[PDB]
């Protein structure tokens, strides 16, 4: 009776038909109910025009869901923090409301003034909270541990940002520049949305990225959380600027041809009771709360309150949050962070995913959370058909990244989160000689090909666990004095620069259907990321980006950046990230050489410390004439210039089409190359005919 298009793609799935039937029934029932009673998902997600503070027909309306409160008032600067004349009334659903008429022809609550939701739980003292739907919240940055104020953000026309540029088209493959605004300046301080837009966005575009993953936008009280512990879900993080400054940022990005994705954190809320959503739990039943209660509401998770995703008002909140970011700020999509935590009641904490599908589909699978994400993905692709929604999920759950209507969760891409640990282990523990070519290839190629992933050698992940950059692992403190272009570099610096290029490149080429690079790592930025904390004396010295290093001409950082720039350009030209054509023809363990085919390019990697292989035979698909497409040993990338960019490499027949016995490394043709130690070279077939 029931068959799902996902079963066609992966046979092992139908073994869990009972689990999927329930999941789909739950999703369809909830959608059906939203459609009948709320006008469908698109209309249901317009919640921010109804909750929080909105201006209508010459009046101001403020709504706040708080079923547990018995009395409620709006307090603020506008009424001198006395709500005796701004008492709200409760409807049958525990939604509090008030209509405040304009005073002197102008809105009763001035733009940029402070407000709080005032309520009492049971005959005692008033409790004052920042509205759940507030759009801006500020704090005195001079004071340590300073509480936030809810700010009514409703600029006059002359101070409302006006979008001047359209959204770029969906790229064939995302080349993502992962970024954090506060730490994006060279100065030891919290940097701004405007500085980022004006000084960093052009760097991103000059490097041929097509997407920015913008982290730490949703308001968070704890700077060192990297945005992961959200307090005010509708508020643009105020330490870096206003909501209008962020609108300027997204628009500037679009003008450079860059798509912008935002980090969406719906896996939890901060447990910060004085500033955030968690202040709305006063001990009621979960049905009248954002969150589960008892163990279910936290599971011993640090700084975390867990959503009851089955709650109607919780769905309205989160789904509207998504529309808010897309509509108001022109984002081109999102990354849902903490998806591993949402998918399972054990949040995958000490798991442990060997590949037994029972680990994915059992009573531990969170249906409430999955239904939410399906509704979210259906919504988002309807609001913006060209949207890209990335899941951050370490578990690698099947059909996470298949269309909702096929029976999947609806995400476009997963992150290949296992990749960096390979390079990290190798760089810490295994001598160059002991590096396995097959083990590298396995890490990169072991993925699901029915779904798309974004590959990266390193990101903000490794930073939050306190790991060192690939560059510093390679070169350490030598980088501070050994990066001069004026004098020849030491063997170990030469070594690091080459491997940095090779690691990034093979990860891009073999790693997946998209690429990601964290701010600074494109040019092998030294040191590491460390937020101001008591243990570093509140120093910003490692909470910044040293742009000077890549900008100064007498240093060698430029060479890694130029290579990163060219690596991305190569992908723009040849489109190999969007190609299913992937063939690893040679994994030479003795010589330390990897050879593979991705798209129309032939890649040769020599990880050997010293040996130059001359006349190295490499398999290829089409016969003809081959030239250097991209070569890491080029002088422009700080190489030795040993490989010739103009030299022809003609092909030899090797058996016949489709007969694996006669073929060379399973390939129907072959050609020869020069391969110096620690180089990576891609090759393309010169088009003949063409001209002439
Ligand atoms: O069908 C007749 C009905 O139609 C209209 O109601 C519809 C609403 O307009 C529509 O929004 C939707 O209702 C949602 C509701 O918006 C949402 O808030 C949620 O309601 C929850 C509350 O969130 C929750 O706090 C709790 O509320 C009460 C509880 O009912 C009561 O038992 C007691 O304990 O106090 C609590 C707090 O004060 O539970 C409710 C109900 O689960 O979910 C609703 C959907 O179930 O759909 C409505 C139906 O179409 C009209 O507005 C209404 O006047 C008509 O009677
Ligand atoms: O919540 C209860 C449901 O959980 C799902 O994970 C299971 O697949 C169903 O069999 C079960 O009825
Ligand atoms: O509890 C809310 C508090 O907000 C603060 O900004 C004010 O100093 C107090 O007047 C008020 O009591």
Curated annotation (Swiss-Prot):
Keywords: Amyloplast, Chloroplast, Glycosyltransferase, Plastid, Starch biosynthesis, Transferase, Transit peptide. One of its GO terms (molecular function) is cation binding. Its EC number is 2.4.1.18. Its main location: plastid. One of its GO terms (biological process) is starch biosynthetic process. It is found in: Plastid, Chloroplast; Plastid, Amyloplast. GO terms for cellular component: amyloplast; chloroplast; cytoplasm. It comes from the Eukaryota. It catalyses: Transfers a segment of a (1->4)-alpha-D-glucan chain to a primary hydroxy group in a similar glucan chain. The active site is at 337 (nucleophile), 392 (proton donor). Pathway: Glycan biosynthesis; starch biosynthesis. (1,4-alpha-D-glucosyl)n binds at residues 81, 116. Catalyzes the formation of the alpha-1,6-glucosidic linkages in starch by scission of a 1,4-alpha-linked oligosaccharide from growing alpha-1,4-glucan chains and the subsequent attachment of the oligosaccharide to the alpha-1,6 position. Monomer. Belongs to the glycosyl hydrolase 13 family. GlgB subfamily. Isoform 2 lacks the putative transit peptide and may be a cytosolic isoform. This is 1,4-alpha-glucan-branching enzyme, chloroplastic/amyloplastic. It comes from Oryza sativa subsp. japonica.
């Amino acid at each position: 009776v029931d068959h799902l298009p996902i079963y066609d793609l992966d046979p092992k799935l139908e073994e869990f038909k009972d689990h999927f039937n329930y999941r789909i029934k739950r999703y369809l029932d909830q959608k059906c109910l939203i459609e009948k009673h709320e006008g469908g998902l698109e209309e249901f997600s317009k919640g921010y025009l109804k909750f929080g503070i909105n201006t209508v027909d010459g009046a101001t309306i403020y709504r706040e869901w708080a079923p547990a409160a018995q009395e409620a008032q709006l307090i603020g600067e506008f009424n001198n923090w006395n709500g005796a004349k701004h008492k709200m009334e409760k409807d049958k659903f525990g939604i509090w409301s008030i209509k405040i008429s304009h005073v002197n022809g102008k809105p009763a609550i001035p733009h940029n003034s402070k407000v709080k939701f005032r309520f009492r739980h049971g005959g005692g003292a008033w409790v004052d909270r920042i509205p759940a739907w507030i759009r801006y919240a500020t704090f005195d940055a001079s004071k340590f541990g300073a509480p936030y104020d809810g700010v009514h953000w409703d600029p006059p026309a002359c101070e409302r940002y006006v979008f001047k540029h359209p959204r770029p088209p969906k790229p064939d493959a995302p080349r993502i520049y992962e970024a954090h605004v506060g730490m994006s300046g060279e100065e030891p301080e919290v940097s701004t949305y405007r500085e980022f837009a004006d000084n960093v966005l052009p760097r991103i575009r000059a490097n041929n990225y097509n997407t920015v993953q913008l982290m730490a936008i949703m308001e968070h009280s704890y700077y060192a959380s990297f945005g992961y512990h959200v307090t005010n879900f509708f508020a643009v993080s105020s330490r870096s600027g206003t909501p209008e400054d962020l609108k300027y940022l997204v628009d500037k990005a679009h003008s450079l041809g860059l798509r912008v994705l935002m980090d969406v954190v719906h896996s939890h809320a901060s447990n910060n009771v004085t500033d955030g959503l968690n202040g709305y739990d006063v001990g009621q039943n979960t049905h009248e709360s954002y969150f589960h209660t008892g163990d279910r509401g936290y599971h011993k998770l640090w700084d975390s309150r867990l959503f009851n995703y089955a709650n109607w008002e919780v769905l309205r909140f989160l789904l509207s949050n998504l529309r808010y970011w897309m509509d108001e700020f022109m984002f081109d999509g999102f990354r849902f962070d903490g998806v591993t935590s949402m998918l399972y009641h054990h949040h995958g904490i000490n798991k442990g995913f060997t590949g037994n599908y029972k680990e994915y589909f059992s009573l531990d699978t969170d249906v409430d959370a999955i239904v939410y994400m399906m509704l979210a993905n259906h919504l988002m692709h309807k609001l913006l058909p060209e949207a890209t929604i990335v899941a951050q999920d370490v578990s690698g759950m099947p059909v996470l990244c298949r269309p909702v209507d096929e029976g999947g969760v609806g995400f476009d891409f997963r992150l290949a989160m296992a990749i960096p640990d390979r390079w990290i282990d190798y760089l810490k523990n295994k001598e160059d000689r002991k590096w396995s070519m097959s083990e590298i290839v396995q890490t990169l190629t072991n993925r699901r090909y029915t779904e798309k992933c974004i590959a990266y050698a390193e990101s903000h992940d490794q930073s939050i666990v306190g790991d060192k950059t690939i560059a510093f692992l390679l070169m350490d403190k030598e980088m501070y004095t050994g990066m001069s272009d004026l004098q020849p570099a030491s063997p170990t610096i030469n070594r690091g620069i080459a491997l940095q290029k090779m690691i990034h490149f093979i990860t891009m080429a073999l790693g997946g259907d998209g690429y990601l690079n964290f701010m600074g790592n494109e040019f092998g930025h030294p040191e590491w990321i460390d937020f101001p904390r008591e243990g570093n004396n509140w120093s910003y010295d490692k909470c910044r980006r040293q742009w000077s290093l890549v900008d100064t001409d007498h240093l060698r950082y430029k060479y890694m950046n130029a290579f990163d720039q060219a690596m991305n350009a190569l992908e723009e030209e040849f489109s190999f990230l969007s190609s299913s054509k992937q063939i690893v023809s040679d994994m030479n363990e003795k010589d330390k050489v990897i050879v593979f085919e991705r798209g129309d390019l032939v890649f040769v990697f020599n990880f050997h410390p010293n040996k130059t292989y001359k006349g190295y035979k490499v398999g290829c698909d089409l016969p003809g004439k081959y030239r250097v497409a991209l070569d890491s040993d080029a002088l422009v990338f700080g190489g030795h210039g040993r490989v010739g960019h103009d030299v022809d490499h003609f092909t030899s027949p090797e058996g016949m089409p489709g007969v694996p016995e006669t073929n060379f490394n399973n390939r129907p043709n072959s050609f020869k190359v020069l391969s110096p130690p620690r180089t990576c070279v891609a090759y393309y077939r010169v088009d003949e005919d063409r001209e002439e």
